[PDB]
Design a protein around this motif. Structure first.
Motif, PDB file in Angstrom:
ATOM      1  N   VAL A  63     -17.320  13.294   0.493  1.00 35.85           N
ATOM      2  CA  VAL A  63     -16.208  13.041  -0.856  1.00 35.85           C
ATOM      3  C   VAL A  63     -15.600  11.368  -0.553  1.00 35.85           C
ATOM      4  CG1 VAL A  63     -14.285  13.543  -2.412  1.00 35.85           C
ATOM      5  CG2 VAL A  63     -15.628  15.184  -1.209  1.00 35.85           C
ATOM      6  N   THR A  64     -15.841  10.423  -1.466  1.00 33.26           N
ATOM      7  CA  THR A  64     -15.167   9.174  -1.541  1.00 33.26           C
ATOM      8  C   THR A  64     -14.524   8.787  -2.591  1.00 33.26           C
ATOM      9  OG1 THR A  64     -17.280   8.292  -1.487  1.00 33.26           O
ATOM     10  CG2 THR A  64     -16.299   8.483   0.735  1.00 33.26           C
ATOM     11  N   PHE A  77      -9.634  13.416   8.450  1.00 32.69           N
ATOM     12  CA  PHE A  77      -9.745  12.957   7.336  1.00 32.69           C
ATOM     13  C   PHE A  77      -8.451  12.952   6.250  1.00 32.69           C
ATOM     14  CE2 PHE A  77     -14.164  11.790   6.917  1.00 32.69           C
ATOM     15  CZ  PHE A  77     -14.994  12.514   7.714  1.00 32.69           C
ATOM     16  N   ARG A  78      -7.825  14.204   6.710  1.00 35.51           N
ATOM     17  CA  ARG A  78      -6.558  14.178   6.059  1.00 35.51           C
ATOM     18  C   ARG A  78      -5.822  13.075   6.487  1.00 35.51           C
ATOM     19  NH1 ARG A  78      -1.970  17.966   9.306  1.00 35.51           N
ATOM     20  NH2 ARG A  78      -0.829  18.745   7.529  1.00 35.51           N
ATOM     21  N   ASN A  79      -5.886  12.617   7.517  1.00 36.60           N
ATOM     22  CA  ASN A  79      -4.989  11.432   7.988  1.00 36.60           C
ATOM     23  C   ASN A  79      -5.665  10.123   7.128  1.00 36.60           C
ATOM     24  OD1 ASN A  79      -4.573   8.804   9.998  1.00 36.60           O
ATOM     25  ND2 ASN A  79      -2.884  10.195   9.764  1.00 36.60           N
ATOM     26  N   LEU A  80      -6.963  10.210   7.113  1.00 38.66           N
ATOM     27  CA  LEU A  80      -7.492   8.995   6.294  1.00 38.66           C
ATOM     28  C   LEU A  80      -7.282   9.031   4.861  1.00 38.66           C
ATOM     29  CD1 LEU A  80     -11.056   9.124   8.096  1.00 38.66           C
ATOM     30  CD2 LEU A  80      -9.497   7.223   7.974  1.00 38.66           C
ATOM     31  N   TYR A 128      -5.817  15.186  -4.373  1.00 36.01           N
ATOM     32  CA  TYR A 128      -7.248  15.106  -3.934  1.00 36.01           C
ATOM     33  C   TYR A 128      -7.707  16.606  -4.416  1.00 36.01           C
ATOM     34  CZ  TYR A 128     -11.132  15.242  -0.896  1.00 36.01           C
ATOM     35  OH  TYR A 128     -12.545  15.458  -0.616  1.00 36.01           O
ATOM     36  N   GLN A 129      -6.909  17.673  -4.250  1.00 34.62           N
ATOM     37  CA  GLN A 129      -7.410  19.054  -4.439  1.00 34.62           C
ATOM     38  C   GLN A 129      -7.680  19.248  -5.874  1.00 34.62           C
ATOM     39  OE1 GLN A 129      -4.261  21.695  -3.548  1.00 34.62           O
ATOM     40  NE2 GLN A 129      -5.907  23.391  -3.077  1.00 34.62           N
ATOM     41  N   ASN A 130      -6.909  18.836  -6.663  1.00 34.71           N
ATOM     42  CA  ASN A 130      -6.846  19.090  -8.273  1.00 34.71           C
ATOM     43  C   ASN A 130      -7.752  18.432  -8.822  1.00 34.71           C
ATOM     44  OD1 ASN A 130      -4.316  20.883  -8.298  1.00 34.71           O
ATOM     45  ND2 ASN A 130      -3.136  18.755  -8.257  1.00 34.71           N
ATOM     46  N   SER A 131      -8.185  17.093  -8.319  1.00 35.54           N
ATOM     47  CA  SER A 131      -9.277  16.535  -9.104  1.00 35.54           C
ATOM     48  C   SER A 131     -10.434  17.317  -8.717  1.00 35.54           C
ATOM     49  CB  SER A 131      -9.522  15.073  -8.277  1.00 35.54           C
ATOM     50  OG  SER A 131      -8.232  14.043  -8.330  1.00 35.54           O
ATOM     51  N   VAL A 132     -10.516  18.002  -7.772  1.00 35.86           N
ATOM     52  CA  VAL A 132     -11.697  18.567  -7.324  1.00 35.86           C
ATOM     53  C   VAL A 132     -11.847  20.039  -7.855  1.00 35.86           C
ATOM     54  CG1 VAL A 132     -13.283  19.335  -5.525  1.00 35.86           C
ATOM     55  CG2 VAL A 132     -12.306  17.095  -5.168  1.00 35.86           C
ATOM     56  N   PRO A 158     -16.541   2.121   2.510  1.00 36.52           N
ATOM     57  CA  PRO A 158     -16.256   3.313   1.609  1.00 36.52           C
ATOM     58  C   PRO A 158     -14.928   3.890   2.501  1.00 36.52           C
ATOM     59  CG  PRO A 158     -18.460   2.865   2.203  1.00 36.52           C
ATOM     60  CD  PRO A 158     -17.756   1.920   2.932  1.00 36.52           C
ATOM     61  N   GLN A 159     -13.998   4.397   1.704  1.00 39.91           N
ATOM     62  CA  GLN A 159     -12.959   5.244   2.407  1.00 39.91           C
ATOM     63  C   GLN A 159     -13.217   6.694   2.144  1.00 39.91           C
ATOM     64  OE1 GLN A 159      -9.837   3.629  -0.693  1.00 39.91           O
ATOM     65  NE2 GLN A 159     -11.201   1.674  -0.484  1.00 39.91           N
ATOM     66  N   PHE A 160     -13.729   7.276   3.150  1.00 42.06           N
ATOM     67  CA  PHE A 160     -14.095   8.721   3.252  1.00 42.06           C
ATOM     68  C   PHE A 160     -12.723   9.618   3.224  1.00 42.06           C
ATOM     69  CE2 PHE A 160     -18.167   7.194   4.084  1.00 42.06           C
ATOM     70  CZ  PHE A 160     -18.226   6.141   4.716  1.00 42.06           C
ATOM     71  N   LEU A 161     -12.722  10.682   2.331  1.00 42.35           N
ATOM     72  CA  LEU A 161     -11.656  11.063   2.200  1.00 42.35           C
ATOM     73  C   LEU A 161     -11.917  12.781   2.696  1.00 42.35           C
ATOM     74  CD1 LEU A 161     -10.926  10.320  -1.576  1.00 42.35           C
ATOM     75  CD2 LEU A 161      -9.870   9.246   0.560  1.00 42.35           C
TER      76      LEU A 161
END
Lengths: 318, 326
Positions: B163-164, B70-73, B84-88, B144-147
């Protein structure tokens, strides 16, 4: 990245995790009584992930996170400085003495020492921790007593390991040419060992006593030093403290020069009041002394050990 | 200093996406993803006694599925791990309009859905193929772009989440929504959805409304080509019952809404998408609207026993959607 021994990797991972974790939990206005009974526990189990340095499964436990975190600022240590000393580069071995205990480590930067205590000791730290902390409150972090910065319990292969991180007696820069372990006890075990014929021998009481040991601190500093001593050994007395000694490290400058020179020859003096203290400059001839009380945790009964310990050390200085 | 949320579940999430992302910041980015990476996971069990409990549960577990893939995705979808981290973790994720739960980061950029144990398994079966697909689309799909995919547990209760990046934009507001399944007439309309909130209109709702969807002729091409290979990819697997989410944003209406807000600070007291960030948007051939379209449910009379199959749903889905835009 981590260390060699999987435990050294779980340590670095732990002091890193716990310190970061603490960076989000605000600093309280005061330590509540519960803080001396609390703890943090983490159980990791990574499958086919992150295993080039860490064990795939391991546990890490930190005793009373808030109280030690306070003991740190009280000893003027920045948590992040503490964290980097432990996580930047794997902690090298020092010399785990040939008796009670198991191991003695020191951060790559020689500033903090990681002693592997026993389950017994970890229980002692808890019994004394509250009073000791109140003591530190009213000394402004100025004591010859070990300044505990953190206490952990790592587990790998279901094997628990206890550790007690503390700022070292000797400096991270200057080298200790001659060492001592002055117990102050009335003539018993205190002399010639295989140690005398070792890398750096840990000479005892009578060895130091017969050497007519020179320890000229002055009359200004010898006073201030001995007065600390009086209140420490008195504090320990207030709470039955088991056979503790005074660690003595000697650093000959002139000798240091020669050693430093050869190092510079192959390619072809000052402590720091705060960032590597416990040091004492000699009144005249180039030397630095490193002295502080030592095994506060764990043949006459110890309450009387106080007056003896202070009276022995009372004569060392001049 | 990062505090937590209201529900203990939201606090264990923020603590988890923070822990896992930081944890990942120390494990180097591989030259390539090995096969094991699609079978790996990270598991953490916390039990704090009288410590750190003003926001977190004293005991909880957090599990991250295939951290490396996922980290690669993520980088493949051009998302910075720290962004990504801060948004969450910056501010607790607010609830949305759940069709079990549907959350969205404070910044509206990422959406957090609560999947089922079944779905988490579906993700594993498709994950290697889906990832290979994403490799050869350059992260340019309506899929859907799975993150990230996690499983938090509090009170011994496991909760799964996926999360997406969201279909609709984090900045612009969706005035009218749709859930075009493309299926041959059935429950092709919405019941109590017409209520009052933002209704999730359906096939026939959209069909009868004489729906204007002018994307242009250059973008309609790129969309339909992009749609052709997605629905075809999903077909290749077995995936079905998925729909196309449609969000419409009327600019002129937006202005009025924006004005009143500015008008109250006077009384009582630039415009479109970012191709990169809001990457599902579509400008209308005339300067008047923005469309948000992407495939969505990728996981889970007369005669019921004789219906439509995966390979048949494909051509239908593309054919229905093929007429939406002009």
């Amino acid at each position: 990245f981590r260390a060699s021994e999987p435990i050294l990797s779980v340590l670095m991972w732990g002091v890193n995790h716990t310190i970061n974790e603490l960076s989000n939990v605000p600093v309280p206005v005061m330590l509540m009584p519960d803080d001396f009974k609390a703890y943090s526990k983490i159980k990791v189990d990574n499958h086919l992930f992150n295993k080039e340095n860490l064990p795939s499964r391991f546990k890490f436990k930190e005793y009373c996170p808030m109280v030690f975190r306070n003991l740190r600022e009280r000893f003027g240590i920045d948590d992040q400085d503490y964290q980097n000393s432990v996580t930047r580069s794997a902690p090298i071995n020092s010399d785990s003495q040939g008796r009670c205990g198991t191991r003695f480590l020191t951060t790559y930067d020689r500033r903090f020492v990681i002693k592997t205590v026993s389950s017994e000791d970890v229980a002692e730290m808890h019994n004394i921790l509250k009073k000791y902390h109140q003591f530190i409150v009213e000394c402004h972090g100025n004591t010859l007593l070990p300044q505990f910065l953190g206490m952990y319990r790592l587990t790998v292969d279901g094997v628990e390991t206890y550790m007690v991180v503390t700022r070292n007696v000797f400096s991270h820069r200057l080298t200790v040419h001659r060492k001592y372990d002055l117990k102050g006890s009335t003539v018993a075990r205190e002399a010639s060992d295989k140690e005398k014929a070792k890398d750096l021998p840990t000479f005892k009481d009578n060895d130091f006593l017969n050497e007519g040991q020179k320890l000229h601190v002055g009359e200004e500093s010898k006073k201030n030093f001995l007065e600390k001593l009086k209140r420490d050994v008195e504090f320990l007395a207030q709470l039955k403290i088991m056979d503790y000694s005074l660690l003595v490290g000697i650093h000959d400058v002139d000798r240091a020069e020669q050693e430093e020179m050869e190092v510079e020859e192959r390619a072809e003096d000052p402590s720091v009041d705060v960032y590597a203290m416990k040091s004492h400059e000699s009144s005249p001839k180039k030397e630095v002394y490193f002295m502080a009380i030592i095994d506060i945790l764990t043949t006459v009964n110890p309450e009387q050990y106080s007056k003896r310990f202070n009276e022995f050390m009372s004569n060392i200085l001049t």
